[PDB]
Design a protein around this ligand. Sequence first.
Ligand code: MN
Ligand code: MN
Ligand code: MN
Ligand code: MN
Ligand code: MN
Ligand code: MN
Ligand code: MN
Ligand code: MN
Ligand code: MN
Ligand code: MN
Ligand code: MN
Ligand code: MN
Lengths: 303, 303, 303, 303, 303, 303
Amino acid sequence: GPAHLPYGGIPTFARAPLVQPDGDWQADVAALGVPFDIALGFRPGARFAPRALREASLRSVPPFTGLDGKTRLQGVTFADAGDVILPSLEPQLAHDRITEAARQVRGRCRVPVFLGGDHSVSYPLLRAFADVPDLHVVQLDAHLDFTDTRNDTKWSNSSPFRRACEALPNLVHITTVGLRGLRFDPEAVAAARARGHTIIPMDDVTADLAGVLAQLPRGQNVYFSVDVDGFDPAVIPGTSSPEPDGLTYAQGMKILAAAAANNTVVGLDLVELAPNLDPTGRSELLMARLVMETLCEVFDHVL
Amino acid sequence: GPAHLPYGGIPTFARAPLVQPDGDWQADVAALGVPFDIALGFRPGARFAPRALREASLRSVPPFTGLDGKTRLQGVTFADAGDVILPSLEPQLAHDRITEAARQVRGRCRVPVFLGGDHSVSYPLLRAFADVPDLHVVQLDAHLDFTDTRNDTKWSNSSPFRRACEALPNLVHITTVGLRGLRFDPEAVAAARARGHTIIPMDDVTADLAGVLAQLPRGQNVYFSVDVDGFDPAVIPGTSSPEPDGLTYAQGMKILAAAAANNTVVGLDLVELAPNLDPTGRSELLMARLVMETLCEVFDHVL
Amino acid sequence: GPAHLPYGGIPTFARAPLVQPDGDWQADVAALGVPFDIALGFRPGARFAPRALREASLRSVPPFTGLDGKTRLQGVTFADAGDVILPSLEPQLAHDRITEAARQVRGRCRVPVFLGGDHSVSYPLLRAFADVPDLHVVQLDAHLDFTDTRNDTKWSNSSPFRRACEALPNLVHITTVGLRGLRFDPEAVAAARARGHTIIPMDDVTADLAGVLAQLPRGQNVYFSVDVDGFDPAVIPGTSSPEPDGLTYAQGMKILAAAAANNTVVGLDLVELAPNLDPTGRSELLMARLVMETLCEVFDHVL
Amino acid sequence: GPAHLPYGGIPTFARAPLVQPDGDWQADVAALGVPFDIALGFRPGARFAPRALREASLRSVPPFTGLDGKTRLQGVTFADAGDVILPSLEPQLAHDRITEAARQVRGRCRVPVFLGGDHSVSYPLLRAFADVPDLHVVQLDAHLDFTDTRNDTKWSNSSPFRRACEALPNLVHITTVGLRGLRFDPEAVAAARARGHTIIPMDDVTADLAGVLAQLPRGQNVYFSVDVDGFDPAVIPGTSSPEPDGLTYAQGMKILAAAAANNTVVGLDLVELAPNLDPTGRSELLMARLVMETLCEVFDHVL
Amino acid sequence: GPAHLPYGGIPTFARAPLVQPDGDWQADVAALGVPFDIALGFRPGARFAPRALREASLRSVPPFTGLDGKTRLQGVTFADAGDVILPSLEPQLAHDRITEAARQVRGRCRVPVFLGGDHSVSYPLLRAFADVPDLHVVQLDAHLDFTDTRNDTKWSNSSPFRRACEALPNLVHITTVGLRGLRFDPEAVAAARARGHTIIPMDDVTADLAGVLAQLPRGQNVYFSVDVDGFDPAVIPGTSSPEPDGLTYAQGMKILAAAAANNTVVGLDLVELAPNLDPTGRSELLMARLVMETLCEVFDHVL
Amino acid sequence: GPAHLPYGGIPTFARAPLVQPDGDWQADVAALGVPFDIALGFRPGARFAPRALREASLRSVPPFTGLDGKTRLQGVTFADAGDVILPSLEPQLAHDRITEAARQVRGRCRVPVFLGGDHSVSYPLLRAFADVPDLHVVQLDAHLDFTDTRNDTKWSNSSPFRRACEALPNLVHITTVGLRGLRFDPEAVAAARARGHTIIPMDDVTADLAGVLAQLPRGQNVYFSVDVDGFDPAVIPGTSSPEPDGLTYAQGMKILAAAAANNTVVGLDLVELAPNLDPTGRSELLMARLVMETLCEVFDHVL
Ligand SMILES: [Mn+2]
Ligand SMILES: [Mn+2]
Ligand SMILES: [Mn+2]
Ligand SMILES: [Mn+2]
Ligand SMILES: [Mn+2]
Ligand SMILES: [Mn+2]
Ligand SMILES: [Mn+2]
Ligand SMILES: [Mn+2]
Ligand SMILES: [Mn+2]
Ligand SMILES: [Mn+2]
Ligand SMILES: [Mn+2]
Ligand SMILES: [Mn+2]
C-alpha cells in the first residue's frame, strides 16, 4: 500500500499507533510527551517541542537500512501514548501527573521515550524509575542542573537532578557531558562531586572524545537525558539558553551510541527543544533523528 | 477528568478519533485532509494546511456553549479520516485517490469536511458527489477558478470548477462570492455566465450584504467551497495569491450561515491556506474556527 | 539639545527617568512592568511585552502637539519604576510581589500604568487598590476572564477578575467590552451578570457605538484593563488567543476616551501583548501609542 | 507562446524590458528605482523595496481584462530603467544622481514611475519636474513631511516637500490625504497652510469621502506621491513607522482614481515600503498592484 | 564608473547582461534558472532559489582579486539566459522545456551554470549532454538520488541520476561525495555499484580528505551537480531535507577545486536551495559564492 | 534580595547603572552604544545591535564563578553611559558626537566597551585615543577595512581603520585576524602592508593558531575591534555580509584572551551585529557573552 510523505498523515511519533497511557497495549518503544515549559528562566517554547518532534519524526520512520546494507530497528514495535494532561500552573500537580503517566508507559514498553518540555520534567519522569537498582543517568547538557534553589523555587529547570537524587536513593550516579559557560552554581557543583557524580566539560570532549567515551558507565542500568543545548547552537539553535562551542550532532550521538552498547538503557528524555526559536526547522529534524538513531543503537546491541 | 490545553495531545481535527476512510465507522462529521499544493502557480505551502488546521482546531473542540448560554453541536459526533495518501507528482493518480477517499468518507458521515491543499483539489472532491441531484456549489473566493487551460495544464488550481462542471452534469449551479482583482480570464467568465452561474463581486458584498444573502440558493443541495483568499489579506494573510479588500471573517461567516439555514449542506472544503505565509498564526486559527462555526450553523438547521 | 531617535538610548517607558518602586520620587504617571506569562493556556510571549512596549513607546514620547496645534500632556511628569522582580514558578509569591510593587508605585504617582504580562496579573495589581471606594473596572477584552477554576488552577489568566472581586469587596462593578468567540464559561457569564456586571459583546459595539459609550460608568473611580486581544487580530495579531472581528484601534480608543472624560481614572494595565507573535512589530507600536493616547485623554479631563 | 509564472524570470517591473536611464528608447510607462533609505529615522528596509516591488509586479503584468470584459492598458508600452546608482552616504550626491536619472527617464516616457526608497527621495525626484507649469502634488501619507529641520539635518524623510517647494517655484500646490498620529510639527503645518497647501486628515476621509474627492485638483498637472504608510498598518504593515486607522486599499485607490481621471498625471512615486517588515509579503503584492491599477486609471482617461 | 551596491539594480547572475536562451549571444559562462520544485517530497521553496541566487551573486561580481594580488575570471564574460518557462504540473512537458533551454544555452557558452530547482531538474539538464563522450558526474549530495521509483513516480528528486543513466549511455560514471543519513535505498545503492559508480560517504571525507580527492576523476569530461544539502545544515540550513554532520563550505569547495583542476568541466547545476527556509539569508549568499568560486577554479585550468 | 531573570528589568549593559557620559561617575568598565548603520553597503540592522547586546548581556551579568569555583570580575564595577545622540544622516556631525562621547566615557572608566553600529564607527571611536602612545589595534574581521574610497565616500564601513590611521599617527600598528573572501582591495592591502600592519588570513588560524597567537603584541596599549563577521556565519549569522569558514567562538576568544593576558587593554568595540538577520537570537547572545568573557580575561591580568 502507498505510504504518506512527511507532510501527510496525523503526526504521531515515528508514525506509530496512538494509545492511552493506561490502555491495554504493549510495544518495544513508546513515546510520551510532556509539553511543560513554565519552569525555564529565559525563552519559552519547549511546550511546543513534543508536537514538533512528532512531526519531524515522520522523516525518520523505522526500520532503517544503512548505506552498508545493514538494517536496524527491524522488528521493533512503536506506540505513541500522547501527552500527559497538564494543568495550568500547579507545578506539584503537574509533577504527579507526569510521574503517573511515565509509570504506566514504562510498564507497557521496553524503552520509553519522553519528549519535553523544559528540563524540569526530568525530575517527575525519573520518579517512575524508583525500582531500578543502582540507576545511572547519562546527561548531555551545557548545564549541570543540580541546583537546590533558583529564583525562589525548588522546581526550576536548573534543579531536576538535585530533586531526583533526593527523592530516589537508587539514583546512585550521574554522568554529565558537555558542560560549558561562564557561570556555574558552586553549591550545585560541590553537591554533585560530593556524591561522586562525573562532570565532563565540553573541553574534555573536544580534547579527547575517546577518553570521554572511556568515562561512560559499563554494565549499568542507564537513563539518558538529552538537553538539546548540549549541542552547539550553530547545529541546534532552537533552545532557550544556548552556549557556544557545544557538541556536534556526531559527537553527541557517538556518546549515546557508546553508552547504549555497554549498558541496559531504561529510558530517554529529550528536553529544551524550542521549535519557535529555529525557523529553519533543522533543530527538530536533527533531534528527532537523534532519538531514532539512539534507539537503533539500543536495540542493535541489547542483552 | 482533566482536559488537554491547545498545545497538548495529538492533533486530529476537533480532537476526534482517527479512522480509515474505508474503515468500519460512522459519525455526523468526518474530516479528510488533502495535502496537495503542486497545482498552484505562485507560493507553495498549502500542503501543510491540513495539519495546521488540525492543530488550530484544538482551540475549537465541540460542542460550544455561547455567550447566550445555549449550546451548539451537542451530541454531534466527529471523526478524522486522516489524509489522502498522495503520490509525488502524478496529478491524475492524486485525483483518483482523492475522489475514492472522499467517496468512502461521504458514505460514512452526514457532513464531510475536506482540508486542502490548493484549490485544484475541489475537482476530484466534487466527483464524489456526482449522484447529488441539482447540486449547487457556494464558493467563497477572490478568483473565479473556471479557467479551461492555464500554463499548459488542465489541472491547475484555476480550473477546478471548470473540470468539475464538464465532468458532473448534476452540478447545475455555482454561486461565487468575493471576486475581485485586476485580471480575470475572459474565456472563463463568459463560460461561467453561459452555464447560468451566479457571480457576486466583493463590491456587491460591500454595497449591500443583505442583498447578497438574498442571491444565495434556497432549498437546494449545497456543497461549500471556501478559498481562504476570499477573505481580506489583513484578516487572513496566509495564502498564495492575496487580493486587497476582501471579506471580513464576519461577512464570510454570514454568507455561510445564511446558506446553511436555507439549504441541505452535503459537504465543505477549506482550501488555499498557507500557514508558512503567516508567522502570526492567525490565519489557521481563524479558518479552523470558521469550519467549526460553519458546522454549528449547519447542524442548527438540519432537516 | 539633540534628541535620540527611536532606536537610540536605553528603553524606558516614554523615555522617562528610571526609579525604584519604593524610592524617594513623585510623578504624575509611573510605569511598572510585570513580565509574567506562565498562567496563559496557549502561546507564551507576553513576558517580553513590557520590554517591547518600552521600546515602542520611544516612538511616542510626550508631550504631544496635534495637527490642530494644541498640546497634550504638557508638564505631565513620567517615571519608569522598572519591573516587579518575579521568581520562577511560585505564582502566589509572584502575586505578592506584584501587589507590593503596585502599592508602592501607586503611592508615588497619580496614574500608574502596568505593563503585562498575561491577564492573570490584573488580579495582584488590583489588590493594590483596596482603598478605592466603589472601584469600577472598564475592561477591553475578547474574553470575560471571570472563571472560578480552569485547568485545575485558580490563578489562570481566565480568572483574574473573579479572584479580584473575592479579594476586594470594594470592586463593585466591571464593564467588559469586546466579547466574542464560540465558547464562553456559562458559570462565569451568569455569575458576572448576577453580580450586576455589564457585558458588552463586540456585536453591540459594531451595531451601535453610541449606545455602548452610554453604558460606560460616570463619575466613578475607574481602573482600565486593556487586553490587546480585544482588538481585531488584523490590527493587533501579536497575542496568544486571537478572536476575529474585534475592535479597531479607533473604536477601543473612543471607548477609553469616553470613560476617561467622565470618570476619575485610578490606573491602567495593558496585558496579553505577545511581541514574538508579530514580526511586523505593529502590535507593540500601536499598543504603546494606545497607552500614551489614553493618558492624553485622562489628563485632559482630570478633576 | 508560454508565459512565465510569478516565480519565474528576471524580475523587472511589470516584466517590461530592461533599459538604461540615458539609453536609446521610448515607452508610455517607465519605471526607475531609488534604493535609498538612510534618511528615515526608525526602521530601515525601504532600500529593498524597488526589488520587492518588481518581484511583486509579476503578479500584475499588463494589460488587464476585468470582470466586465473591458480591457485596460491595451497597447501601453512599459520599460524598466533599473535603479539610480547611489553612493554610500553622501546624500547630496545621491540627490543629484536621482534628479539626473529622473530627468532622463522623464524625457523618454509619458508617465515615469519611481520606486523608493524612503520619502526623502521625493525631493530630488521632483526637481526633475521643474518645467511643469502649476505643478500639483497629490500625496497619500500619514505624515505631512513638510518639516524644515529634523535631527540636525535638512535631508530627512520628514522634509522632502519642504525642500522641493523651496527649490521649485512651479510646484504651486500640494494636497495631502490620510494625515493622522499623535504628533505633528507645528512649524511644518503652519508653513504648509501659509503656502495654501491642502491638508486632509484621515478623519475627513472616514467622515466624508465625497467631501475629500471634491477637494482634489481638476484639470491640473499632477504628480502622485504615495507613502505606503498612508494605508492602514493592518493592510500594509511593511513600513518603518505605521500609524493606526489608515486608508483601506480601496479608499486610497478611490482617491488616486479620481485624481487620475480628472488631471494630467506627469509622474508617480511609491515610497516607504519595507518588505523586510512584512514576512507575509502582502505589503509589496498590494502596493505593486496599486501602482498598476493607478496606471490603468491614468491611461483610461487620456486626452 | 560608479557601481551598484548589492541591493541596487536588476538581479542577474553575477550582474551579467540579460539574454535569451535562443538569442544572438556568446559568453564564457551562461546562467540558466529552473524554478521547479514540485518533485521533492518534503518542504517546497526551491522554485525561489534561482531568484535568490541571482540576488546573492551581486555580492560576488567577477572578476576577483584575492589577498595575494592574483586576479581570477579576468576577461571571462558572463550572461544570464533567464529561466526556463515552465508549465504548471505537466512534469514531462517541463522536462522537455528544460532540456531544450539547456541545449540552446550550452551551445552559446563554454561553461553553463544551471540554478535549481529541486534535484529532479538534473535529469532533463543532463539530457542536453548526450554528445559528451564518456561523461562523468561529480555529485555533492547527502543522498544518492539513484532510486527507480518513489511515492509512485519515476520523476521525483530521488531519481534524477537513475533517469539520466537509463537515457544517456554516454554517462558512464558518477562519483557522489557527502552521503550520510539513517536510510538508503538498497536497490538504488546496488544499481549504482553495478554500474561501477563511486560512492563516497561523508565519513570518508572526515576520515581522509586527501584520499577522497585522489578518488575524483582525472582527464575526463565532468558535469558538476551540487545539492546544497551535501553541506552541513549549520552552514546551509536552507534546504528541504537536511542531514547533520555534512561538508563545510571549505571541504565542498576543495572537492570542486580539485576536480575542476584535473578535468574538462562541461557544466554545473546548483540544486535544492530553499531560501524560504533560511531567514538569515546565509544559505543563498554562500551558495552563490560557491558557484562563482568554482568558476574561478574552472577557468584557472582551461585548455 | 531576589534578582531579575533575563526578561526582567530595564536592559542596561551587564545590568549596570545608567549614567551620562559627562556625568559625575566612575566605574572600572563603562559601556557606550553607537546605533549608527547608514555607512554599510548591504543589509542594515546594526543600528539595533546596541539594544540587542544590552538585552543579551542580562544573561551574562558579572561577577562570574566558573566550573573550577574561581570567580572573575569580582568587585569590578560597571556602568552604562547610554548611546551617543546621533543626527539623521550628517555623518561628519555623527563622527564628532561619537568622538566626544567616547572621550568623556574614557575619562571616567578604566576599560570602555563600545557597542556598534556598522564598522565605520571604529574611526570616530579611535579618535578618542589620540593621546595613547604607540596605540596598537587587534582587529577580528573577515575584511581588512583599510579602504580609502568606496562607492564615492570616505566614511563607509570599509574605511574605518584607514581613516583612523591618517588621523592618528600614534596608531602605529594593526593586527587583523580572520581575513577571508574572494575579493580584496589591492590598494587597501598595499597601504596596510606599507605601514607594516600584520595581515592574518583565517587559513593561518586554521593551519596553526599557536603561530597566530605568537604574532600578537606584547606589553603594548591595545584596542580590540571585534567585527562579528570575523566569526563563522554558522555561529554568528546575524551580520550584513557573512563569509564562510570563519572563526569559531572558541578561536576568536582564544585570540582575545591571549592579547589581554600581556597587554594594556585600552578599549574594545563590537560591531556589525545585525539582530534582525538572526531570528534564533544566538548571534546577540554569543556576542554579548564574548564581550563579558573578554573583560574577565582583561581583569585577570591587570598590572
Ligand atoms: Mn538541562
Ligand atoms: Mn541545558
Ligand atoms: Mn482564490
Ligand atoms: Mn480558489
Ligand atoms: Mn483577558
Ligand atoms: Mn483576552
Ligand atoms: Mn511620507
Ligand atoms: Mn509617512
Ligand atoms: Mn540531497
Ligand atoms: Mn540530491
Ligand atoms: Mn569590518
Ligand atoms: Mn567585516
